[PDB]
Amino acid sequence: QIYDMTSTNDVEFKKKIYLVLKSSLSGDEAAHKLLKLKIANNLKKSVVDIIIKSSLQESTFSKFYSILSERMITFHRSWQTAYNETFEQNYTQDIEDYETDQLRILGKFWGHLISYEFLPMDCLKIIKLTEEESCPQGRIFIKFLFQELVNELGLDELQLRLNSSKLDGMFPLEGDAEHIRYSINFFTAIGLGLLTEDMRSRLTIIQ
Amino acid sequence: TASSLTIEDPAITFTTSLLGRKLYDKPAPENRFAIMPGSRWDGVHRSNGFEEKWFAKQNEINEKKVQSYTLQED
Amino acid sequence: SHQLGGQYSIPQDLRENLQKEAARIGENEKDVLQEKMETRTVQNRE
Amino acid sequence: TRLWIKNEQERQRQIQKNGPEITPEEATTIFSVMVEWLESRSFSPIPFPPLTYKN
Amino acid sequence: SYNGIGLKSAKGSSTSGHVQRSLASNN
Amino acid sequence: SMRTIMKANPALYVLRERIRKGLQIYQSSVQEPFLNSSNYAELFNNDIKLFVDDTN
Amino acid sequence: NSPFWWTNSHHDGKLWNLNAYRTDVIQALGGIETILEHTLFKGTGFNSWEGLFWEKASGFEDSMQFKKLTHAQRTGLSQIPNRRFTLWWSPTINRANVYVGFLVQLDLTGIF
Amino acid sequence: NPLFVQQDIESIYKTNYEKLDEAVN
Amino acid sequence: FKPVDITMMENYQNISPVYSVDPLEKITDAYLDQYLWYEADQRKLFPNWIKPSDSEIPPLLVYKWTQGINNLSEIWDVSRGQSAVLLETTLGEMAEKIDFTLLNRLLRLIVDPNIADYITAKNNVVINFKDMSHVNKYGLIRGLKFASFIFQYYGLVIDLLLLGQERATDLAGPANNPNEFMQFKSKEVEKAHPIRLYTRYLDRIYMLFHFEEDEGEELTDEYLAENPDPNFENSIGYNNRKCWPKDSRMRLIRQDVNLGRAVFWEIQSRVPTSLTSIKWENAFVSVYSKNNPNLLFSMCGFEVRILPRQRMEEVVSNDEGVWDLVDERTKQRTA
Amino acid sequence: SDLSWSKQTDTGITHFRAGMTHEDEKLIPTIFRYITTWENEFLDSQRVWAEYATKR
Amino acid sequence: RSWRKGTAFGRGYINDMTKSEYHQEFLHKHVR
Amino acid sequence: HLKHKTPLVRQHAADLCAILIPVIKNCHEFEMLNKLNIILYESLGEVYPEVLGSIINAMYC
Amino acid sequence: AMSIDKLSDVVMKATEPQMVLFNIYDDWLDRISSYTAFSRLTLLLRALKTNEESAKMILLSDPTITIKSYHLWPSFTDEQWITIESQMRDLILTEYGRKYNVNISALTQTEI
Known part of the structure; x- marks a missing residue:
């Protein structure tokens, strides 16, 4: 019995996907190919890992990888859980690596999935803004996310989504002064700052 | 990298010699080694004109490594 | 003086800032034909 | 090409005969x-290139 | 079956004319 | 003797040259022979082979 | 025709890069080794395929002759580069496995 | 770009007798 | 000058001419060309709208024309009666219809008379092809290095006739601070005139009108007055994009069709038959209105249609080849 | 998709048709993958020239 | 109606192949 | 060096054969001259005149 | 071989008799033939055999270049390998000069 420290079993499966992906005009005919392989539920978790990466090597964001996922997320609910779980793996573990450029490609990539509801938006619950726990790269990830997530919806429609999503750690209204002075500080810098108009009352009352 | 992040960051918004010898202030002419003129420099170019001619050769040699392949044909 | 659309190339007033430099710095440059004009005249050997 | 040049010549002869259309x-x-x-x-009309011209 | 899709025939084609339904676009 | 005949014969060597002049191929460097050696280059013939080291 | 009429790459700079295409194709064909199973690469007797260089004909064409060439000499195309292409790919372009075809042996050789 | 550095590099290993003699002694 | 040889290059559908001038004359033509462009661009001769210009590759031009259409005020609002109209018309034999008696003058304005003479005379040349030869007594010869400058200048002469002086002063801005390609000073300067944007790309013309029930109905009233059409056949010779499907192509409706024909009627009447030939066959008009959601055109090689996101009725996640047009101010995506 | 309806609705993509015959699973990458689309370049040049100007 | 006012200019079979009407249409297109 | 791409190196490869011939013969290798000679024969259809000239020179030696 | 980080980490910990696969070439065989790969490998072992720590200094200089979780050797580009083969090439000579006290300009090229 032989342990394998080689990834040769895996590397063969990064090719197969990446080549299916670098053929294929448009994204709907590269979503035909993947769904035509009938990948096992074991790997379907880690096929999304490849698609996100091949998105980051691409030097700019594209609508290909968006619609490739959109056609795929609606196919079967097993791929619902593959993107939902890989938005957590990125934000927590895998943001620590990325250059300030590849955060601009991720931000727009989870922008189209959230703003069209494919994600949905309660999967953004993990985002927590504190001085204590945040990666500076983690901050840049959100900055690019809302710049995208505002553009489509328009910041008036965005409030309608944020108000229904009961985001706690991200929009704390309950106390902890510095945190609300922080969250407010953050969204003024991004250039939206209207989402804080509600929270700007809670400071002055507590102040 | 570090620069980029510490920059592309909202939080930042909220807030000279190798051996400690005095260093100049205003922008100096560029140089092969990037050394910075001493605090005492008057600020006039004084040069034979070589240091600029080395760049022209430096750029040339660095260019014809690219031009050689790209102009290749068959 | 509001723009329509946006800026995608470089800001408009920045090109003239560049194209003015080429007049300032260029008159000291000795262009290709300017060089060969002098090289011809024997005094460059001396 | 022989046909095209023939139409050109026909056109220009007919503009000699009839005259300009303006x-x-x-x-x-x-x-x-x-x-x-x-x-x-x-507007300042474009000059003729002088004897010593900068460019 | 030929349900209105594909080609009149694959001769002038340059392809085989194999038509397959798309898995991506259904719902 | 075959190891040394493959690399010696003027006739064979004239195939190997004449093919190259046919293909119009050149190899850059010329150091290459400053690297490794004859019986060394033997291993990479496709047959399957192994090495064993018991020092450890 | 210069099919790029919409750019001066001096002013605009080069607006695309296809470098990655070349590597990705190379691994879509199975890598450099399986690509070179189809060639004479081993015939040449080079050890490694890494530094191969093909003669670029762009060099010496100008000084062939001037006045002298006969019509065919000057206008016609040289068969020499196609011969280079069919020597390099010969063992696929000539292979015995063929569907329908007949053996011949060249006069004084053992080449079928 | 050439597909391979080894073309563009123009040379591989040229031993420097001056540095080694300094580094050895 | 020496004679000028012709050959024809085959494009398999077009066959196009090619002029080869002599090198001694090629050098003076080249120097003269480069010089005139340097001065004329230095002194702000040609306004912004004329444009196979230096700053923007053609696809960038197309993208700024769409973004420009969107960002101008109120277009997509149909709340009352409003409408919008594009034109695309090729000026006809613009190079073939030039007259050198008129050239020589119009250049004597803008250039020293020696160079105006050299240009006006450089377009008489015996044109040789094998046996055949003829003196070129009438049109422009496009194979001369400065024929670009001549061509664009004569196009400006046409362009002022189309826009008028008032509007052209408005689009091109004041001489002291000339505008950029799409700009104005205030919203008032836009809204003061029904022609909002204009461009020219060599032969082609692109115009965009914004009308209301008042202006539009006045137009269609006068066009129906001088070209009365009782049989409702205005939709026969009316041409539109066939690349798109029916649903999303331009819907033909008497109000819209009579606009298109009326706009093209007016502008056809602005330019004389002598300078160039503006025909309905070569013009495409598309009317955004109550009943037409799409706005169609084609610049360069592209073919674009612009849905305002208001009228999409359902908004689907999008493919690759679809632009999303932004309102610079709020930075939403409205189209 | 649907040559008969595509004259009217824009049915979308219902089906695919084989372009060229690639034996079995062997897939050759196409260009349109390696060229960044014009929007993405213009929305890049916006930010890139803006940032350049700020740094200057 | 200020906009309309402003402008300056505002408001048979011949027997032959080459001089015919069908012919000019031909060289009006394919010779571009 | 007669297999090297840069045509200068193929000059100096052949220019150094014309020198060694009088020494090779004194050492009495006639099996080692016929090896150089054939190799200089198969290259005798070279394109570069600067290189083709010096190969004939070594052939003449 | 035992002087490498990964392999020592596996052989020290493992408490059973067992087989373990590795790929010594990481992914070098994409851009490199097996010949030159084996050649660089023996150079990386010969400089690790002799100097050790000072060779590992040559490998681990820049932390920006990272060994992946899969591979053994740090992932360089082609040119960084072309220089590192020259440094690893140098340690053998400086060390030889230290050992036999021969100033190395006294050697014939073949001897090098």
Whole structure:
């Protein structure tokens, strides 16, 4: 019995996907190919890992990888859980690596999935803004996310989504002064700052 | 990298010699080694004109490594 | 003086800032034909 | 190409015979249009390249 | 079956004319 | 003797040259022979082979 | 025709890069080794395929002759580069496995 | 770019007798 | 000058001519060309709208024309009666219809008379092809290095006739601070005139009108007055994009069709038959209105249609080849 | 998709048709993958020239 | 109606192949 | 060096054969001259005149 | 071989008799033939055999270049390998000069 420290079993499966992906005009005919392989539920978790990466090597964001996922997320609910779980793996573990450029490609990539509801938006619950726990790269990830997530919806429609999503750690209204002075500080810098108009009352009352 | 992040960051918004010898202030002419003129420099170019001619050769040699392949044909 | 659309190339007033430099710095440059004009005249050997 | 050149020659002979198609009225109005525009823009006519010209 | 899709025939084609339904676009 | 005949014969060597002049191919460097050696280059013939080291 | 009429790459700079295409194709064909199973690469007797260089004909064409060439000499195309292409790919372009075809042996050789 | 550095590099290993003699002694 | 040889290059559908001038004359033509462009661009001769210009590759031009259409005020609002109209018309034999008696003058304005003479005379040349030869007594010869400058200048002469002086002063801005390609000073300067944007790309013309029930109905009233059409056949010779499907192509409706024909009627009447030939066959008009959601055109090689996101009725996640047009101010995506 | 309806609705993509015959699973990458689309370049040049100007 | 006012200009079979009407249409297109 | 791409190196490869011939013969290798000679024969259809000239020179030696 | 980080980490910990696969070439065989790969490998072992720590200094200089979780050797580009083969090439000579006290300009090229 032989342990394998080689990834040769895996590397063969990064090719197969990446080549299916670098053929294929448009994204709907590269979503035909993947769904035509009938990948096992074991790997379907880690096929999304490849698609996100091949998105980051691409030097700019594209609508290909968006619609490739959109056609795929609606196919079967097993791929619902593959993107939902890989938005957590990125934000927590895998943001620590990325250059300030590849955060601009991720931000727009989870922008189209959230703003069209494919994600949905309660999967953004993990985002927590504190001085204590945040990666500076983690901050840049959100900055690019809302710049995208505002553009489509328009910041008036965005409030309608944020108000229904009961985001706690991200929009704390309950106390902890510095945190609300922080969250407010953050969204003024991004250039939206209207989402804080509600929270700007809670400071002055507590102040 | 570090620069980029510490920059592309909202939080930042909220807030000279190798051996400690005095260093100049205003922008100096560029140089092969990037050394910075001493605090005492008057600020006039004084040069034979070589240091600029080395760049022209430096750029040339660095260019014809690219031009050689790209102009290749068959 | 509001723009329509946006800026995608470089800001408009920045090109003239560049194209003015080429007049300032260029008159000291000795262009290709300017060089060969002098090289011809024997005094460059001396 | 032989046919095309024949139509060109036919066209130009017929413009010799019939004359120009502008009429002097239209030409006058066009000329007025230009002059008024170039005054509005205060244009400096392009000179002839001097003996010693910078460029 | 030929349900209105594909080609009149694959001769002038340059392809085989194999038509397959798309898995991506259904719902 | 075959190891040394493959690399010696003027006739064979004239195939190997004449093919190259046919293909119009050149190899850059010329150091290459400053690297490794004859019986060394033997291993990479496709047959399957192994090495064993018991020092450890 | 210069099919790029919409750019001066001096002013605009080069607006695309296809470098990655070349590597990705190379691994879509199975890598450099399986690509070179189809060639004479081993015939040449080079050890490694890494530094191969093909003669670029762009060099010496100008000084062939001037006045002298006969019509065919000057206008016609040289068969020499196609011969280079069919020597390099010979063992696929000539292979015995063929569907329908007949053996011949060249006069004094053992080449079928 | 050439597909391979080894073309563009123009040379591989040229031993420097001056540095080694300094580094050895 | 020496004679000028012709050959024809085959494009398999077009066959196009090619002029080869002699090198001694090629050098003076080249120097003269480069010089005139340097001065004329230095002194702000040609306004912004004329444009196979230096700053923007053609696809960038197309993208700024769409973004420009969107960002201008109120277009997509149909709340009352409003409408919008594009034109695309090729000026006809613009190079073939030039007259050198008129050239020589119009250049004597803008250039020293020696160079105006050299240009006007450089377009008489015996044109040789094998046996055949003829003196070129009438049109422009496009194979001369400065024929670009001549061509664009004569196009400006046409362009002022189309826009008028008032509007052209408005689009091109004041001489002291000339505008950029799409700009104005205030919203008032836009709204003061029904022609909002204009461009020219060599032969082609692109115009965009914004009308209301008042202006539009006045137009269609006068066009129906001088070209009365009782049989409702205005939709026969009316041409539109066939690349798109029916649903999303331009819907034909008497109000819209009579606009298109009326706009093209007016502008056809602005330019004389002598300078160039503006025909309905070569013009495409598309009317955004109550009943037409799409706005169609084609610049360069592209073919674009612009849905305002208001009228999409359902908004689907999008493919690759679809632009999303932004309102610079709020930075939403409205189209 | 649907040559008969595509004259009217824009049915979308219902089906695919084989372009060229690639034996079995062997897939050759196409260009349109390696060229960044014009929007993405213009929305890049916006930010890139803006940032350049700020740094200057 | 200020906009309309402003402008300056505002408001048989021949027997032959080459001089015919069908022919000019031909060289009006394919010779571009 | 007669297999090297840069045509200068193929000059100096052949220019150094014309020198060694009088020494090779004194050492009495006639099996080692016929090896150089054939190799200089198969290259005798070279394109570069600067290189083709010096190969004939070594052939003449 | 035992002087490498990964392999020592596996052989020290493992408490059973067992087989373990590795790929010594990481992914070098994409851009490199097996010949030159084996050649660089033996150079990386010969400089690790002799100097050790000072060779590992040559490998681990820049932390920006990272060994992946899969591979053994740090992932360089082609040119960084072309220089590192020259440094690893140098340690053998400086060390030889230290050992036999021969100033190395006294050697014939073949001897090098």
